[PDB]
Amino acid sequence: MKTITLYLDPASLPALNQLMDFTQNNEDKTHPRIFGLSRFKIPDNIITQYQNIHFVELKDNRPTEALFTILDQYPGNIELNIHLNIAHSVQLIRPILAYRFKHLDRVSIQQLNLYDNGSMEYVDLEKEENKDISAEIKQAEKQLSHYLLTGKIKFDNPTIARYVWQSAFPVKYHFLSTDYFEKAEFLQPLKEYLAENYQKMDWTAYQQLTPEQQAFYLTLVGFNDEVKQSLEVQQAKFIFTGTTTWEGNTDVREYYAQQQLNLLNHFTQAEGDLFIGDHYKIYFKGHPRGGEINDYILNNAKNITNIPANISFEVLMMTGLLPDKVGGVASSLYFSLPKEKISHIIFTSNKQVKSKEDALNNPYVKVMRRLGIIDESQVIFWDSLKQLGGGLE
Ligand SMILES: Nc1ccn([C@@H]2O[C@H](COP(=O)(O)O)[C@@H](O)[C@H]2O)c(=O)n1
Numbered sequence: 001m002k003t004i005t006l007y008l009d010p011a012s013l014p015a016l017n018q019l020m021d022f023t024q025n026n027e028d029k030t031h032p033r034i035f036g037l038s039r040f041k042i043p044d045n046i047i048t049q050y051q052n053i054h055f056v057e058l059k060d061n062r063p064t065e066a067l068f069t070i071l072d073q074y075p076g077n078i079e080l081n082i083h084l085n086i087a088h089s090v091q092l093i094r095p096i097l098a099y100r101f102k103h104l105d106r107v108s109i110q111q112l113n114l115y116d117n118g119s120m121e122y123v124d125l126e127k128e129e130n131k132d133i134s135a136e137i138k139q140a141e142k143q144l145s146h147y148l149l150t151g152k153i154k155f156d157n158p159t160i161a162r163y164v165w166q167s168a169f170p171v172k173y174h175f176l177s178t179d180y181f182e183k184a185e186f187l188q189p190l191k192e193y194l195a196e197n198y199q200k201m202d203w204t205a206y207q208q209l210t211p212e213q214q215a216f217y218l219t220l221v222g223f224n225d226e227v228k229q230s231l232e233v234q235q236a237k238f239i240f241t242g243t244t245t246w247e248g249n250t251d252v253r254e255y256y257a258q259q260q261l262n263l264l265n266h267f268t269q270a271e272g273d274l275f276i277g278d279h280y281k282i283y284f285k286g287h288p289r290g291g292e293i294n295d296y297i298l299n300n301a302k303n304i305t306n307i308p309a310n311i312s313f314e315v316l317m318m319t320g321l322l323p324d325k326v327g328g329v330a331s332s333l334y335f336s337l338p339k340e341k342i343s344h345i346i347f348t349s350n351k352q353v354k355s356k357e358d359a360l361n362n363p364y365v366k367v368m369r370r371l372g373i374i375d376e377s378q379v380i381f382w383d384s385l386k387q388l389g390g391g392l393e
Contacts, residue, residue, distance in 0.1 A: 001076070001077040001078070001079060002032065002074060002076065002077070002078050002079070003031070003032070003078070003079045003080075003081055003110060004032040004033070004034065004071070004074060004078055004079070004080055004081070005022075005025075005031060005032065005033050005034070005081045005082075005083070006033075006034045006036070006080060006081070006082045006083065006096070007019075007021070007022065007033065007034065007035050007036065007037055007083050008036045008037070008058070008063060008082070008083065008084055008085070008092045008093075009036070009037050009038070009039075009083075009084070009085045009088075009092075009115075010038045010039070010058050010061050010085065010088060010092075011038075011039065011085055011087075011088075011117050011118070012039055012118075012312040012314060013085075013115060013116055013117060013118050013176075013312075013314050013336075014083070014084065014085040014086075014114075014115035014116070014117065015037040015038075015039055015040050016221060016312060016314055016315060016318050017083075017115045017174060017201065017318075018037065018083045018115070019037070019040065019217065019220045019221060020205050020206070020217065020318065021083060021113075022035075022220075023209060023213050023216050023217045023220065024205065024209065024213070026213060026216060029049060029050050029051060030050070030051045030052055031052065032052040032053075032054070032074065033050070033052065033053050033054065034054045034055070034056055034067070034070055035053070035054070035055050035056070036055070036056040036057065036058050036063045036067075036092075038057075038058050039312075040220065040221070042055075042220065043219060043220075046216070046219065046220070054070045056070065058092075060091070061088045061091040061092060062091050062092065062094055062095060063092065063095050063096075064095075065095065067095050067096075067099070068095070068099060071099055071107075076106065077106045077107075077108075078106065078107055078108075079108050079109070079110040080096060080100075080107070080108070080109050080110055081110045081111055082096065082109065082110075082111070082112050082113070083112075083113045083114075083115070084112060084113070084114045084115070085114070085115065085116075085117050086114045086115065086116055086117060086121050086162050086163075086173065087116075087117040087120050087121055087124070087162065088117065089112075089114055089162055089165070090147075090153060090155065090158065090161060090162070091153075093112075094151050094153060095151070096109075096151075097147065097148065097150075097151035098150075098151035100151075101149060101150055101151055109168075109169050110170070111169060111170040111171065111172070112165055112169050112170070112171045112172070113171070113172050113174065114162075114165065114171065114172070114173045114174065115173075115174045115201065116174065116175055116176040116201065118176065118314075118332050118333075118335060118336065119176075119332040119335035119336075119363075119364040119367075120332075121162070121176075122176075122177065122180055122335070122364065122367050123363040123364055123367070124159045125159060125180075125184075125187065126363065126366070126367060127159065128157070128159055128160065128186070129186045130186070131157075133160070133186065133187065133188075133189040133190050134189040136156075136157045136160040137160060137163075137164060137189060137190065137193055139156055139157065140155060140156070140157055140160045140161040140163075140164045141164045141167040143155050143156065143161065144161065144164050144165075144167055144168060145167070145168075148168050160190070163190060163193075163194065166194070166195075166197050171197055172197060172198070172199065173194065173197060173198040173199070174198075174199060174200075174201040174202070175198055175199070175200055175201060176200075176201050176335065176336055177200075177335075177371070178198065178199070178200045179371055180367065180371065181194070181198070183370075183371065203317050203318060203320070204320070205318075206318060206319050206320060207320060214319075217319070218319070221311065221312070221315045221318075222308070222310055222311055223308075223311055223315055223319070224308075227307060227308060227311075228319075228321070230283070230305050230307075231283075231307070231316070231321045231323070232321075233281055235279070235280075235281045236277070236279050236280045236281065236324050236325075237280060237281045237282075237283060237323035237324050237325070238267065238276045238280040238281070238282050238283065238323060238324065238325040238326070238327065238343070239283040239284075239285050239307065239316075239323045239325070239326050239327075239328075240263075240264050240267060240282070240283065240284050240285065240304075240327060240328040241285055241287075241313070241326060241327070241328035241329055241330075241331055241333065241334075242260055242284060242285060242286040242287050242290055242293075242294060242297055242309075242328065242329060243256075243260065243287050243290070243328075243329035243330075243331070243348060244256070244287050244289050244290055244291075244293065245293075246348035246349045246350055246382070247348075247349035247350055247351075248348075248349065253292070253293055254296065256293055257293045257296035257297050257300070258296075258300075259382070260293075260297055260328075260329065261297055261300050261301060261390070262385065262387060262388060263328060263329065263346055263382065263385060264284075264297075264301060264304075264328065264390075265388045265389065265390050266385050266388060267282075267327055267328070267343070267344075268282055268303070268390065268391065269388060269389075269390065269391060271388055272388060273380075273384075273385055273386075274327065274343065274344045274380070274385075276325055276327070276343060280324070280325065281305065282303060282304045282305065283304065283305045283306070283307050283323065284297060284298060284301060284304050284305070284306050284307065285307045285309070285313060285328075286298075286306075286307075286309035287309060287329075287331075288309050288310055288312075290309055294309050300390075301390065302390055302391055302392065302393035303391060303393050313331070313333040314333065314336060317336060317337075322337070322338075322341060323341070324341065325341060325342075325343045326341050326342060326343065327342070327343035327344045327345070327346075328345075328346060329346050329347075329348060329382075330345045330346060330347045330348070330359070330362070330365075332364055334364070334368070335364045335367075335368065337373075339372070339373045339374070342373065342374055342378060343378070344378050344379075344380050345365075345374070345378060345379055345380065346380045346381075346382050346385075347359035347362070347379065347380070347381055347382060348382045349382065349383070353381075355381055356379060356380070356381040356384070359379050359380075359381055360376060360379055365379060
């Protein structure tokens with residue numbers, strides 16, 4: 001009998017956790033492994049250090065049929081150790097269940113580990129408030145039972161169905177916020193149901209790795225030594241969170257770069273509404289899709305250190321390298337931050353948010369307020385901030 005480990009995630013946070021798992025186990029060069037991590041390209045010179053390492057694409061949040069070709073290479077008794085994104089867990093496991101059903105005499109499921117996509121799961125759970133959660137749970141377990149057979153998907157409640165895997169397999173959920181589950185009154189039947197099958201997502205695994213493994217992990221996640229060192233400087237640090245564009249009544253991208261620079265000044269300069277303090281070392285963390293806007297911001301900002309835009313913000317939490325303060329344009333990344341690290345979150349114009357009032361009603365912001373992670377005073381609408389100049393370098 002042999003174990004095969006599958007690492008599936010279309011997004012970022014689960015993949016970052018899954019790459020940690022792989023790193024933790026990286027002394028084993030031959031354990032069969034299947035990577036379907038859409039956002040992460042494992043470098044060739046890491047891959048060739050391993051045997052029985054396989055790669056699969058995801059298509060509409062499902063591993064392609066190329067998964068069957070890989071699994072056919074192991075014709076004896078196999079046990080699958082599966083790692084999933086919670087939000088997308090149903091779609092991700094479909095081809096696995098189909099395969100198991102075909103080969104139920106020799107293929108079996110060892111266990112599941114499931115990790116939050118991020119704020120998504122929480123936003124989706126809020127929509128379930130005022131349903132009979134106990135009733136939703138039991139129904140989802142029943143419908144999961146049929147899915148288990150054939151690999152046929154039908155769930156009346158797709159959100160709750162994410163949380164009933166324990167009715168079929170050994171499972172461990174890794175939650176961004178256990179406080180959410182323990183404090184949300186309406187979710188008490190779900191929290192009680194999950195029993196000891198969940199834990200808070202651990203951000204400390206990196207500290208127990210060998211130095212060699214730590215470097216391996218950083219390589220996996222596109223975090224080079226220059227950037228790490230910059231984030232090891234023994235001084236107070238502030239990271240500004242850049243964005244792409246918004247509804248500014250212009251399609252001139254230089255405008256959006258200019259305005260983001262104005263927002264940054266409100267943190268860096270004493271004259272700013274949001275002045276962080278004179279003693280902070282300042283960093284710019286551009287949006288991964290900012291493109292040439294990031295170049296403009298970097299070029300015009302003074303006394304600032306770039307953190308390559310392509311790195312997922314959550315890598316910082318994963319590696320213990322979060323700064324003292326984080327501020328700037330709003331992103332779901334704020335959901336995952338300890339409250340003492342949040343300065344001010346600035347919201348830009350879109351269809352849903354045209355004011356501070358609207359920003360306070362943003363789905364992840366509302367949860368954050370209720371959990372006491374942020375005060376209303378920490379929520380700023382972008383065009384409330386006057387034009388200010390920057391400093392000298
Ligand atoms: N300045 C920024 C903004 C977003 N991001 C990343 O992009 C992801 C998606 O952000 P949004 O939900 O705000 O679109 C986050 O999980 C975060 O990793 C980043 O790494 N740096």
